Amino acid sequence: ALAKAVYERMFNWMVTRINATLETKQPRQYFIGVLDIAGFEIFDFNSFEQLCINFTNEKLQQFFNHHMFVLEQEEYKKEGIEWEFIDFGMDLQACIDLIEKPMGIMSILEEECMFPKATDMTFKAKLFDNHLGKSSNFQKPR
Amino acid sequence: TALVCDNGSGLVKAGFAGDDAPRAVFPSIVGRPRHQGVMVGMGQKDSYVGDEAQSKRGILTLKYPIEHGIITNWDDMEKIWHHTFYNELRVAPEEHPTLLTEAPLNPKANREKMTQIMFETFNVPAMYVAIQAVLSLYASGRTTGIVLDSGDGVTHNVPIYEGYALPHAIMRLDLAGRDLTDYLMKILTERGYSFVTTAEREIVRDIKEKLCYVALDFENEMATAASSSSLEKSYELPDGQVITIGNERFRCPETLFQPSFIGMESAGIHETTYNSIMKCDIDIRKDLYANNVMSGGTTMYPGIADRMQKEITALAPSTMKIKIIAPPERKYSVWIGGSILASLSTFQQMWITKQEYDEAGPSIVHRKC
Amino acid sequence: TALVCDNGSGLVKAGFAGDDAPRAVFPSIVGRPRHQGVMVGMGQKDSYVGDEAQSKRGILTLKYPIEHGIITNWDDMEKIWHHTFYNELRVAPEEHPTLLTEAPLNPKANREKMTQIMFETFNVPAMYVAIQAVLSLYASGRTTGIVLDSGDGVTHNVPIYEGYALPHAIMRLDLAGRDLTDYLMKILTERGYSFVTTAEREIVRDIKEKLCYVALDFENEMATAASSSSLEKSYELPDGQVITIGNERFRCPETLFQPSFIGMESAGIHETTYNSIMKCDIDIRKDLYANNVMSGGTTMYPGIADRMQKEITALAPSTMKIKIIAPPERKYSVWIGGSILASLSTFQQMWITKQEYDEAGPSIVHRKC
Amino acid sequence: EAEKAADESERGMKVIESRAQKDEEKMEIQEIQLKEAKHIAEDADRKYEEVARKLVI
Amino acid sequence: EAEKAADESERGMKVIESRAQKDEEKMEIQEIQLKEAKHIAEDADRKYEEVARKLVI
Ligand SMILES: Nc1ncnc2c1ncn2[C@@H]1O[C@H](COP(=O)(O)OP(=O)(O)O)[C@@H](O)[C@H]1O
Ligand SMILES: Nc1ncnc2c1ncn2[C@@H]1O[C@H](COP(=O)(O)OP(=O)(O)O)[C@@H](O)[C@H]1O
Ligand SMILES: [Mg+2]
Ligand SMILES: [Mg+2]
Numbered sequence: 001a002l003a004k005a006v007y008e009r010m011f012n013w014m015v016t017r018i019n020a021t022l023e024t025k026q027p028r029q030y031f032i033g034v035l036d037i038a039g040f041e042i043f044d045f046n047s048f049e050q051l052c053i054n055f056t057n058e059k060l061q062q063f064f065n066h067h068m069f070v071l072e073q074e075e076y077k078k079e080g081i082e083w084e085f086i087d088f089g090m091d092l093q094a095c096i097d098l099i100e101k102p103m104g105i106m107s108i109l110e111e112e113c114m115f116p117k118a119t120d121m122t123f124k125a126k127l128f129d130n131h132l133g134k135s136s137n138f139q140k141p142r
Numbered sequence: 143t144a145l146v147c148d149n150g151s152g153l154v155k156a157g158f159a160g161d162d163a164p165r166a167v168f169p170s171i172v173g174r175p176r177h178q179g180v181m182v183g184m185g186q187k188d189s190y191v192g193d194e195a196q197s198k199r200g201i202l203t204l205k206y207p208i209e210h211g212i213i214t215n216w217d218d219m220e221k222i223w224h225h226t227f228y229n230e231l232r233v234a235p236e237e238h239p240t241l242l243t244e245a246p247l248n249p250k251a252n253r254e255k256m257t258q259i260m261f262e263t264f265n266v267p268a269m270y271v272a273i274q275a276v277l278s279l280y281a282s283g284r285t286t287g288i289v290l291d292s293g294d295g296v297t298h299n300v301p302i303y304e305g306y307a308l309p310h311a312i313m314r315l316d317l318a319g320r321d322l323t324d325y326l327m328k329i330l331t332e333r334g335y336s337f338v339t340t341a342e343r344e345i346v347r348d349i350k351e352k353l354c355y356v357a358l359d360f361e362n363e364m365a366t367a368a369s370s371s372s373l374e375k376s377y378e379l380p381d382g383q384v385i386t387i388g389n390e391r392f393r394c395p396e397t398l399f400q401p402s403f404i405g406m407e408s409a410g411i412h413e414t415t416y417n418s419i420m421k422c423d424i425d426i427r428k429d430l431y432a433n434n435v436m437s438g439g440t441t442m443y444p445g446i447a448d449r450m451q452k453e454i455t456a457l458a459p460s461t462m463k464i465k466i467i468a469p470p471e472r473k474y475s476v477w478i479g480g481s482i483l484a485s486l487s488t489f490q491q492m493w494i495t496k497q498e499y500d501e502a503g504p505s506i507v508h509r510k511c
Numbered sequence: 512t513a514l515v516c517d518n519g520s521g522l523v524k525a526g527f528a529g530d531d532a533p534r535a536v537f538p539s540i541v542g543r544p545r546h547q548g549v550m551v552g553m554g555q556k557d558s559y560v561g562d563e564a565q566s567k568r569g570i571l572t573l574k575y576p577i578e579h580g581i582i583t584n585w586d587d588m589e590k591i592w593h594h595t596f597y598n599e600l601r602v603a604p605e606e607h608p609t610l611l612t613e614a615p616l617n618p619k620a621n622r623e624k625m626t627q628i629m630f631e632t633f634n635v636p637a638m639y640v641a642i643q644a645v646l647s648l649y650a651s652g653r654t655t656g657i658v659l660d661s662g663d664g665v666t667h668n669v670p671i672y673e674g675y676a677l678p679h680a681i682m683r684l685d686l687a688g689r690d691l692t693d694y695l696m697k698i699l700t701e702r703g704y705s706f707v708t709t710a711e712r713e714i715v716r717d718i719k720e721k722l723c724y725v726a727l728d729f730e731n732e733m734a735t736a737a738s739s740s741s742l743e744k745s746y747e748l749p750d751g752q753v754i755t756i757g758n759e760r761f762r763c764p765e766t767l768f769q770p771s772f773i774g775m776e777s778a779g780i781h782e783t784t785y786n787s788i789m790k791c792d793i794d795i796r797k798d799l800y801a802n803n804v805m806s807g808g809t810t811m812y813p814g815i816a817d818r819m820q821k822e823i824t825a826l827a828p829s830t831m832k833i834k835i836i837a838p839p840e841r842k843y844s845v846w847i848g849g850s851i852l853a854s855l856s857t858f859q860q861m862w863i864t865k866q867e868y869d870e871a872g873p874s875i876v877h878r879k880c
Numbered sequence: 881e882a883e884k885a886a887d888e889s890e891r892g893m894k895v896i897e898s899r900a901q902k903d904e905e906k907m908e909i910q911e912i913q914l915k916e917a918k919h920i921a922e923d924a925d926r927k928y929e930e931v932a933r934k935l936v937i
Numbered sequence: 938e939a940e941k942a943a944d945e946s947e948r949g950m951k952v953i954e955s956r957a958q959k960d961e962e963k964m965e966i967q968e969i970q971l972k973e974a975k976h977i978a979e980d981a982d983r984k985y986e987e988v989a990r991k992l993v994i
Contacts, residue, residue, distance in 0.1 A: 107487050110487070115486065115552050116279075116284060117283065276549050285553075302549065303570055304570060305553045306546050306550075307547070307549025308546055308570065355948075373944075423569050423710050424711050424714065424748050424750040425568055425710055425750070426569040427749070427751060428750070445948070448952060458751060459750075461747070486551065489551050492551060813930060886946045889946035889950050890946040893946060893949045893950035896950060896953050896954050896957055900953055903957055907964050907967065910964060910968065911967060914967050914974060921977040921978040924982060924985070925981055927981070931985060931988045931989055935988055935991060
């Protein structure tokens with residue numbers, strides 16, 4: 001853990017130094033930002049890392065859906081007759097709750113590491129107990 | 143982030159959920175002035191609490207409101223609650239779920255009224271008292287074994303296997319921590335010193351804190367320190383004197399291992415814990431011997447782990463491995479476990495929200511724990 | 512490759528058709544917790560099955576759902592089916608014909624409802640229950656003789672000549688394997704030990720597993736071990752103690768050879784098998800005496816073969832050769848034969864496809880077997 | 881004097897601990913050898929008792 | 938503090954020495970038992986050969 005933390009913080013400090021050699025002193029206040037993010041990941045033998053990255057990638061799609069919904073909402077409002085189903089973001093919220101919302105999935109790992117005698121199988125046993133059928137997005141492959 | 147605040151008679155310790163160290167810990171003394179006021183304009187405080195009170199014991203009388211895991215003279219213990227919440231930890235209870243601690247079975251009425259007092263005036267959102275030992279177990283990450291916390295007010299054992307709190311063998315004992323101090327009073331009268339008052343009676347536990355190591359083969363070590371002057375130790379009071387303690391040094395803690403000195407006719411802790419071992423199945427003894435965990439306070443005395451190992455291995459059949467778990471995280475393991483338990487998300491559903499109490503009446507704590 | 516799964520009360524054994532060894536075998540215990548849950552967040556399993564359940568008997572109650580070849584409390588035996596199929600052998604039944612086992616004549620309603628429960632929920636393709644003894648016969652490659660399987664739940668004999676299952680002499684007896692254990696409880700109370708609970712009651716069959724050898728001339732061997740201390744044997748429980756068993760060692764299995772001890776007024780197994788011999792023609796006795804085959808379990812006790820030979824040759828006219836076939840493949844011969852039977856291609860046409868059951872109603876098992 | 885005296889006893893503790901670990905490792909292999917010797921003796925008793933029964937028959 | 942540390946190093950050395958003495962005591966008892974278990978196994982093999990030879994005759 002210590003090694004990981006020291007490496008990460010080292011990297012960010014190098015980012016600070018890159019800012020340093022590029023420093024400015026003009027009145028700059030309004031920026032247009034380009035962000036690069038890891039792409040959606042689906043392939044063989046995917047552990048935790050993939051779950052994390054996929055969650056990050058899809059939250060941005062949640063952001064997109066809400067944004068386009070806002071603009072089209074006002075536009076259709078000018079032509080106001082009736083909207084189908086507000087908040088396009090629900091389509092993703094249905095799984096956002098499963099991944100994050102307290103005692104969802106990600107929370108279960110937080111709780112499980114704390115709990116004594118962390119054993120891998122008990123993790124899945126708890127998940128099956130807690131979010132099968134109870135959660136309409138948690139099922140088993142074959 | 144709810145809260146966790148220990149109840150134990152000795153040191154009311156306060157902290158926050160999840161944090162690995164109690165934010166503030168202080169002795170549970172409550173003090174009142176025992177002389178008239180002489181220098182007009184002092185603006186005297188009518189009562190004192192905690193280390194502030196311990197600061198000026200000189201003109202103070204000390205009431206411990208918590209004896210033998212029973213909360214007596216509730217007025218001052220409420221005063222301690224109030225001082226804790228606002229001055230030490232410094233948040234209004236109105237925005238923090240709270241968890242307390244309680245010895246195995248103390249009385250029935252205790253919880254059933256304490257929940258009320260801390261839940262009606264402090265107006266806390268939610269609370270759940272958890273029996274000491276199961277919490278101590280969590281604190282060490284071992285979900286199977288016997289707990290011997292012996293928190294200063296009371297000493298007790300539970301068998302817990304595979305995470306089941308097997309009730310009927312719970313073997314409580316009132317060989318409290320304070321009573322070692324009180325007996326040390328009587329044993330220290332003999333060397334010619336005298337400690338009549340209450341303030342000195344508080345000092346002596348401090349002098350107990352350093353100079354009490356339990357020793358194997360009590361007879362041989364006793365005759366040893368009697369014949370030779372090797373361990374004649376010294377110490378000083380905040381008075382100027384220096385005091386020389388002889389074999390009382392290792393005659394203090396052995397009241398634990400046999401109570402014939404204090405008088406109480408209930409076997410020493412090692413025999414009680416062996417008893418509670420032998421009052422379970424013939425298959426749980428395989429593991430129970432292996433995960434023996436000390437806890438609470440009053441076991442920071444050096445050696446006590448080893449002496450305990452000797453006594454048990456003598457008592458138990460010499461085919462089991464009795465390697466006892468005594469981490470030096472003791473005296474706080476209660477609180478560490480409490481914080482971890484408060485950190486468990488699944489645990490969130492358990493404790494009692496105000497609605498249930500209001501609509502159900504006080505007994506809800508017993509009915510639902 | 513269909514399947515073969517024994518029903519017998521003791522050890523539900525699972526494997527595959529053709530294979531010479533059951534893939535997985537486990538005791539048929541079903542367990543429930545008998546204490547409240549104390550360490551929040553365990554995620555307790557609401558029931559347990561098989562060696563997993565046997566692992567933690569400490570806080571468990573044991574129900575055997577299979578007594579005397581009758582399947583009682585069907586809920587848990589269905590639980591055992593479910594655990595078998597998915598966890599031990601690990602294939603969905605949807606793609607595997609299945610064969611079961613059954614004692615000679617237990618009740619009428621047993622099969623007539625068990626086929627339904629295992630054929631309607633598990634949705635198996637096809638099934639056919641086969642009476643124990645005829646299966647045991649194939650297992651040894653001898654198509655003529657008398658079978659004495661005495662599977663732990665029930666003991667019985669059949670005469671089978673030239674591959675004909677001659678019904679009327681089938682001589683069932685409820686001198687089960689478990690009841691030897693239960694009697695051993697009462698006989699072991701006398702030496703001063705005590706085994707009240709259920710977990711210890713499970714242990715004792717284990718302690719029976721090694722220390723019970725049946726001895727000829729019971730009177731003389733009994734007085735022998737009484738006079739001399741030669742065979743005084745020792746053993747240890749997973750507790751630390753060591754237990755010393757005297758003549759109970761060879762007074763255990765002899766309840767089989769005479770039931771006066773257990774009380775049941777039905778002659779010992781040797782007399783019953785001789786009886787079933789003498790209830791056939793005067794020409795089949797020529798061969799029947801020669802091919803006597805033990806089977807099932809509860810006959811791995813050393814010596815029992817020889818003692819049996821002595822009793823029979825004493826009973827039968829001393830002009831026949833009674834050489835009894837007791838291979839050490841016992842305790843599994845049921846399952847070996849079952850696999851071989853499932854391997855027979857001509858046998859494929861026999862068992863019941865779903866169509867017949869659906870269009871005919873439940874009685875099809877009795878009508879067609 | 882006190883720091884010098886402590887240095888002697890912690891050095892003596894370390895060498896006696898090294899001997900104690902050597903004794904423990906030797907004790908555990910001798911324990912396994914004793915269990916193996918008991919098992920072959922018990923199996924040999926069973927082998928003797930079985931042939932003794934067979935002879936009388 | 939140096940005097941307190943010197944007492945802890947003395948106690949450490951003394952308790953590990955006491956444990957090492959108990960390990961040494963147990964080690965000889967295991968060797969005594971080991972000889973008995975081996976002698977019983979050899980005696981059982983000799984006694985088996987007597988019965989097994991007579992059984993063939
Ligand atoms: N240096 C020390 N050595 C041994 N015991 C001590 C020392 N200092 C304090 N103690 C004991 O620890 C006790 C506190 O234990 P207790 O109050 O029962 O647990 P908790 O403080 O968690 O409620 C005090 O009564 C005191 O006797
Ligand atoms: N070492 C042993 N010696 C003799 N009998 C044993 C031993 N171990 C187990 N058994 C007996 O075998 C029995 C199993 O037989 P049973 O269940 O009737 O046949 P199956 O297991 O094929 O259904 C157990 O009840 C037990 O009493
Ligand atoms: Mg305290
Ligand atoms: Mg069986």
